[PDB]
Design a binder for these strands. Structure first.
Ligand SMILES: [K+]
Ligand SMILES: [Mg+2]
Ligand SMILES: [Mg+2]
Ligand SMILES: [Mg+2]
Ligand SMILES: [Mg+2]
Ligand SMILES: [Mg+2]
Ligand SMILES: [Mg+2]
Ligand SMILES: [Mg+2]
Ligand SMILES: [Mg+2]
Ligand SMILES: [Mg+2]
Ligand SMILES: [Mg+2]
Ligand SMILES: [Mg+2]
Ligand SMILES: [Mg+2]
Ligand SMILES: [Mg+2]
Ligand SMILES: [Mg+2]
Lengths: 191, 172, 197, 136
RNA sequence: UUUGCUCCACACAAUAUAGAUGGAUACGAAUAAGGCGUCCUUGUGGCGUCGCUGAACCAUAGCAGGCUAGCAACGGUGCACUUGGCGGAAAGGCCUUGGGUGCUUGCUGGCGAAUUGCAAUGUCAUUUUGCGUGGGGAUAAAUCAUUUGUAUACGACUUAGA
RNA sequence: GCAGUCAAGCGUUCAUAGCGACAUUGCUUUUUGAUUCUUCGAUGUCGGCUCUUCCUAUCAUACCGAAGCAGAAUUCGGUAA
RNA sequence: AGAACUGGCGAUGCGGGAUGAACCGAACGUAGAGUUAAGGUGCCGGAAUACACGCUCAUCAGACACCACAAAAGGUGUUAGUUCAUCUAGACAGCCGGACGGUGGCCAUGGAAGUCGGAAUCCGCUAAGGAGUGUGUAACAACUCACCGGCCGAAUGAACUA
RNA sequence: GGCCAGCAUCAGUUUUGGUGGCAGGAUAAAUCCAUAGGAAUGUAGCUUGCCUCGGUAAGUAUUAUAGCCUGUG
């Protein structure tokens, strides 16, 4: 249909500064600085009042306007990650063999090490992406917590941990063992 | 067929001893020239009434010029066209300054979107939508908003020379 | 309009650039193409990789050394396009092809010479925005070109040197512009402006 | 501490936008967008320069940075009046763009004797400028 | 080497020309963005300005560009010297110091041009080679034959021999 | 010969895990025909042996999805020569 | 493989369909100039990287008749339409709150508690509430949905066509 | 006299520009002018509501401190 103009609003809270040169977005907040290259989308950013950015697509087709809202969501996630942070809680699930998850170092590289998954003698190692913090939750049995500014990095680190523990050659409806994301929220409570 | 003109064509169904002064049927035909206009008149008249060019006569043919060719109008266009597997009526809307321009746009659009050639299309009606909010197509409605402005991003300048020494810009 | 035209191949839509260049050589113009690794091809990198693999499987069955030769370097890919658009089996086509040089990066003969572009072959002017395109250097590396890193390193070095040259030139140009801005209200300058200069 | 977003200001297809006709019967005259037909088509009117009121493809004109207040659909007399009040011709002639067009037309109009005089004057100005550049 | 070889300079003979006829005139990156100028609190900063093509810029007057006389200014430019630096991707080029010499159309004079007859590319470029005149430089190998067998149909290979 | 579509039914209940009637759309040229265009001043007529290469409609091996996949075994399917 | 009519090839070059007896165009003495046919005009290749409105992104894209193949059936890919509906008297989505009394209704089911269940989908209060929409439990207790509200703000749903 | 050309004025064929006078149509339609009537993507004005300059929102209001549409001449 080639809609004349489509636009989305990105709300900027008080303690956040958004610097957008051509299509490289830098978001600065209390928790840190995030950066995203969006030169692949052909959108136009415009600051309105220092609390509102508008992102627009002119003469855009269906896919172009579909990507506009994706741009808005990505910038919103950047802002949410520098203000509230992102935290993913994963639970270990096993029928018989306890899963042994720890943090080890290889040349100072901070791997999540998984042993005894379904009795395996193989040691699985999932690197920790920079910016992601791993904390093992006390008062909850078999819970690993991944926290960070970038939802992309924390969710991909959690997904790597989940994927490393896929069951092979078994009915997965029965052999349900693995490390599964049980919660995805923010670092700051009740916000 | 070409850049269109609109003609009124009036034909007669030639008088006989029993029926002098026959009924003088008129049509509005979009065609590139008067020959095609009269051919189209006989085509549609043969579709409608018991007559043909051999048993009838063209009483008049007159180009109808747009009354206000320099005012932008919204047109509702009812067409009937043959697809590859059937016949369909469709209603479309075209923004243009004249009926002939709207009909040229319509033929282009039918050929582009439904691969319907001129021979497969009947223009049932072209009418100015006098009142906005009777425009019922979004691709026309979006141009009827107040204070409509829009940029033209990524301007491409046509070079008159093979080689440029500047690494051009698409600013506008 | 020059004895040699040096085309900076960066972002230049290999087929359209090849068409322009082939016509230029056949018309008798000497062409030097630089930065062939930064040429573009419309379509996804995976598409163009698949096309090159279709090219790769073609070979003389009884002796592969007779078959079509699959050159991996970006300059030779561009050369293949040009040769396919030149009548290369005739003496005229041979002469046209000797009127051509293609390089990865900008080697020392041409790094201090003016580079031109071809607007009718430029990707940013030709391709619809949002259309995916391939970079010749990436494609060439994927199909077995060995010198992407060396070319990139030498290009970074050349860019440092060329930026220093341009800083000096910009300073001198500002000086000349100031000296022309002064004596712009002179009688000679007013007469020149009256005549259009 | 303030958000910075580069504005990237475009020339807008809008009623009152001044355009320069680049090809056609007008070919170098100023006209005003009277209203917008489609994404690619506008109704323009150039009554001061002699551009007839017409629907034109946006690819046949180049938008100028000049705009003036004009109501949508304004007729030719109204366009003329508002154009005169906004003094569009003076604003356009003051721009480097129109000055460049005029300079290229003047250079095209130079005779051979005038070109010789241009050479002599350029040599004189060059002597002065090179001396100044060596001094500084 | 019945004076051989090489380099440079000059002259003379050839030899051709995928095709000179003012100058290939150097940022990088982006293009839903940039260039330049300027300012500061030096940034993804503010302000100003430009584009809308090189239709530019530079160069360009003088018997294919002669011979002369001045003015003005210490500029521009050619040459051969020369100071130092940078350049290895195919550098073989780029920049810079100093003096010398010529030209200078920045400006103002004096003389010359004709008859190539009303046009005729009306010969102005550079590619190789040879020769002669000077200057400078250096003073071997390879193959056959013989020999080895790490080789081998023959060639080839791989060894040895003042 | 191989592969689709529909889905009445089978599959304890459940059309489609796996199948699938009545119909119907195709593909292939490893079947056999049909034809008689080439060859009757001659293209050496079975099979095997030997050897190379190609195809994929994959038997195995690699990695996977599905199941009427608890395990084991197996079946259906994908990328794959 | 066999007939009808015509036009062809055979017997025929020429321009076009890359190529080809038959197709398209056009039939032919030797030349010059002009204009065209069919077919083309990015480059090969003579001729607009012409103008204009749309459509299409293909991890097997498509690209001019004869002709050198592809079908049924499918796809919230994307485009344009047909018809029927909902909707500022607030449409669909999401979130939040409730979602009854009689009544754990009767019948029974081993155990059913609005819901393994069987008939009626009972009345009242109703904005709404179905003897319930489903789940859960041996049953329960309990949830959950339809449903109704709050927010939200203008579009939405379905079946079809190509 | 032979060979090869240059220009001018013509003739035959043709190609490519500049410019003049007419004819027709709805004696183009338009624009423009005048007039009558309208509504809106509602201009001025006016009322209600905000408050960061002072502007904005909702109504009313058919030319006013913009205009436009239609008919007629
Ligand atoms: K035979
Ligand atoms: Mg198993
Ligand atoms: Mg190799
Ligand atoms: Mg036969
Ligand atoms: Mg024989
Ligand atoms: Mg034989
Ligand atoms: Mg044989
Ligand atoms: Mg397969
Ligand atoms: Mg015969
Ligand atoms: Mg024939
Ligand atoms: Mg063919
Ligand atoms: Mg002839
Ligand atoms: Mg050509
Ligand atoms: Mg189909
Ligand atoms: Mg004549």
């Amino acid at each position: 249909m080639k809609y004349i103009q489509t636009e989305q609003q990105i709300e900027v809270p008080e303690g956040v500064t958004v610097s957008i040169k051509s299509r490289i977005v830098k978001v600065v907040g209390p928790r840190g600085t995030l950066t995203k290259n969006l030169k692949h989308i052909d959108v136009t950013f415009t600051k309105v009042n220092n609390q509102l950015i508008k992102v627009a697509v002119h003469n855009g087709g269906r896919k172009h306007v579909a990507a506009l809202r994706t741009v808005k969501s990505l910038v919103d996630n950047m802002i949410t990650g520098v203000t509230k942070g992102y935290k993913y809680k994963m639970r270990y699930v096993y029928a018989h063999f306890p899963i042994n998850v720890n943090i080890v170092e290889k040349d100072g590289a901070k791997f999540i090490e998984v042993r005894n998954f379904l009795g395996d003698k193989k040691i699985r190692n999932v690197p920790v992406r920079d910016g992601v913090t791993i904390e093992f939750s006390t008062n909850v049995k078999d819970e690993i917590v991944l926290s960070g500014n970038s939802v992309e990095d924390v969710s991909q680190n959690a997904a790597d941990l989940q994927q490393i523990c896929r069951v092979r050659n078994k009915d997965i409806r029965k052999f349900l063992d693995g490390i599964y994301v049980s919660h995805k929220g923010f670092i700051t409570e009740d916000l | 067929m070409a850049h269109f003109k609109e003609y009124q064509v009036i034909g007669r169904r030639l008088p006989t001893e029993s029926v002098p002064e026959p009924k003088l049927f008129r049509m509005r035909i979009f065609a590139s020239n008067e020959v095609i206009a009269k051919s189209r008149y006989w085509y549609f008249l043969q579709k409608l009434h018991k007559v043909k060019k051999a048993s009838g006569e063209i009483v008049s043919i007159n180009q109808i010029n747009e009354a206000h060719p320099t005012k932008v109008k919204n047109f509702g266009v009812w067409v009937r066209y043959d697809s590859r597997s059937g016949t369909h009526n469709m209603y479309k809307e075209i923004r243009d300054v004249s009926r002939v321009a709207a009909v040229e746009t319509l033929y282009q659009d039918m050929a582009a979107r439904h691969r319907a050639r001129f021979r497969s299309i009947h223009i049932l009606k072209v009418a100015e939508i006098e009142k906005t909010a009777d425009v019922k197509r979004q691709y026309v409605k979006q141009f009827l908003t107040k204070d409509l402005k829009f940029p033209l991003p990524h301007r491409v300048q046509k070079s008159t020379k093979t080689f440029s020494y500047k690494r051009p810009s698409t600013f506008y | 309009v020059e004895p040699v035209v040096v085309i900076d191949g960066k972002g230049h839509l290999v087929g359209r650039l090849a068409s322009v260049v082939a016509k230029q050589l056949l018309n008798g113009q000497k062409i030097v193409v630089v930065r062939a690794e930064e040429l573009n091809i419309s379509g996804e990198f995976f598409r163009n990789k698949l096309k090159y693999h279709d090219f790769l499987r073609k070979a003389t069955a009884f002796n592969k050394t007779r078959g079509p030769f699959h050159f991996r370097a970006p300059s030779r890919i561009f050369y293949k396009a040009l040769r396919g658009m030149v009548s290369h089996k005739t003496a005229r086509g041979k002469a046209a092809l000797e009127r051509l040089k293609v390089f990865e990066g900008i080697p020392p003969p041409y790094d201090k010479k003016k580079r031109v572009v071809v607007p009718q072959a430029l990707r940013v002017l030709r391709l619809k925005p949002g259309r995916k395109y391939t970079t010749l250097g990436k494609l060439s590396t994927s199909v077995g070109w060995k010198y992407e890193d060396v070319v990139a390193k030498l290009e970074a070095k050349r860019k440092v040197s060329s930026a220093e040259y341009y800083a000096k030139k910009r300073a001198f140009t500002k000086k000349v512009a100031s000296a022309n801005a002064t004596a712009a209200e002179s009688d000679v300058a007013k007469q020149l402006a009256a005549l259009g200069y | 501490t303030d958000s910075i977003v580069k504005a990237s200001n475009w020339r807008l297809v809008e009623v009152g936008r001044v355009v320069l006709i680049k090809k056609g019967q007008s070919a170098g005259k100023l006209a005003a967008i009277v209203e917008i037909i489609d994404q690619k088509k506008v109704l323009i009117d150039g009554p001061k320069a002699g551009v007839p009121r017409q629907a034109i493809n946006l690819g046949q004109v180049v938008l100028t940075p000049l705009t003036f207040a004009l109501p949508r659909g304004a007729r030719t007399a109204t366009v003329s009046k508002k154009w005169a009040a906004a003094a569009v011709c003076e604003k356009w002639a003051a721009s480097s763009w129109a000055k460049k067009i005029a300079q290229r037309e003047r250079r095209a109009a130079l005779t051979d004797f005038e070109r010789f005089q241009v050479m002599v004057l350029r040599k004189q100005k060059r002597y002065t400028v090179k001396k100044a550049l060596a001094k500084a």
